[PDB]
Ligand binder design. Structure first.
Ligand code: HEM
Ligand SMILES: c1cc[n+]2cc[nH]c2c1
Length: 291
């Protein structure tokens, strides 16, 4: 399967910076969502789940085709709760009907991270919508109730290595688990709509307790009111993972730099970019624009 990036006709940096600003302006406006967390965390989760279907072996799945717009992927049990990120973006797609679905879902994730004061993420245009029959089947996204060997093995399919996996998981400092979506409940920290390295700090400094929640699932709970998933706590159980966790709890700039590279790579897996294709765009935030 080859998927070649095709820039939307005649579009350039300024067009996509207009779509960025539209998403970012609505993130500021619709602030009440999920008890004032706002839409940013569900939008970086949506960009991860449309990319996380990729399989390196046959180049199926991935962010290129925008296939989450089809019922099979929209109704995947693993995507429960992401309909709220879709409905947030649907106004903006009506306003810029020329951007492809893959591009709009991935730029929403980029915009949310930078607007929640994360690192800049280089983003590239050119994903092309593909037919309903290209939609990957349910079951390619990871279970939460498993251990470190499962996480390592699952992420080899998206060929991410240990460092990349640990840098990507730092995004679980954002938002929260919702019992009616996943059977898990609670936030992982106090700053859950500002991008920081707090996931790593909480993992190493809190007093975790294995408890059973109302959906009868086990999760790691702390006195402070935070929770960690079994696959999250996995990172301090494995010796290779645990020493990268310590590296990111001791250096927030290295965390930001490595997250930026692994999230771009995540979003680009499966796509062939021609050598005459434009460079990756670095978008300015509303704040850097005085907007
Ligand atoms: C083995 C890996 C992973 C598993 C099992 C997993 C699982 C989960 C689960 C069960 C939730 C709760 C969903 C809900 O109830 O609403 C969640 C939320 C979230 N995850 Fe993951 N995740 C994984 C990796 C990642 C990665 C790599 C990213 C992003 C780079 C990510 C970003 C998020 C975000 C931002 C949320 C919060 C959503 C919200 O607030 O609504 N996840 N994760
Ligand atoms: C997903 C979203 C939020 N949190 C908080 C701790 N772990 C996780 C996973």
């Amino acid at each position: 399967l080859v998927h070649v990036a095709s820039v939307e006709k005649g579009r350039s940096y300024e067009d996509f910076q207009k779509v960025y600003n539209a998403i970012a302006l609505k993130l500021r406006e619709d602030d009440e969502y999920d008890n004032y967390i706002g839409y940013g965390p569900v939008l970086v989760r949506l960009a991860w789940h449309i990319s996380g279907t990729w399989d390196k072996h046959d180049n199926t799945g991935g962010s290129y085709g925008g296939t989450y717009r089809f019922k099979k992927e929209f109704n995947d049990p693993s995507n429960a709760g992401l309909q709220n990120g879709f409905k947030f973006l649907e106004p903006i797609h009506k306003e810029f009907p020329w951007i492809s679905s893959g591009d709009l879902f991935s730029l929403g994730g980029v915009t949310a991270v930078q607007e929640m004061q994360g690192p800049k993420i280089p983003w590239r245009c050119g994903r092309v919508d593909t037919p309903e029959d290209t939609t990957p089947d349910n079951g390619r996204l990871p279970d939460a109730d498993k251990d470190a060997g499962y996480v390592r093995t699952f992420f080899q399919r998206l060929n991410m290595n240990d460092r990349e996996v640990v840098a990507l998981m730092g995004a679980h400092a954002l938002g929260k688990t919702h019992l009616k979506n996943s059977g898990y409940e609670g936030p992982g920290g106090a700053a859950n709509n500002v991008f920081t390295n707090e996931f790593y700090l909480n993992l190493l400094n809190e007093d975790w307790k294995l408890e059973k929640n109302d959906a009868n699932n086990e999760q790691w709970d702390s006195k402070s009111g935070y929770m960690m998933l079994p696959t999250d706590y996995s990172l301090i159980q494995d010796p290779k993972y645990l020493s990268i966790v310590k590296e990111y709890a001791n250096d927030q700039d290295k965390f930001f730099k490595d997250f930026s590279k692994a999230f771009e790579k995540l979003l680009e897996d499966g796509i062939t970019f021609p050598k005459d294709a434009p460079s990756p765009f670095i978008f300015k935030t509303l704040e850097e624009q005085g907007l």
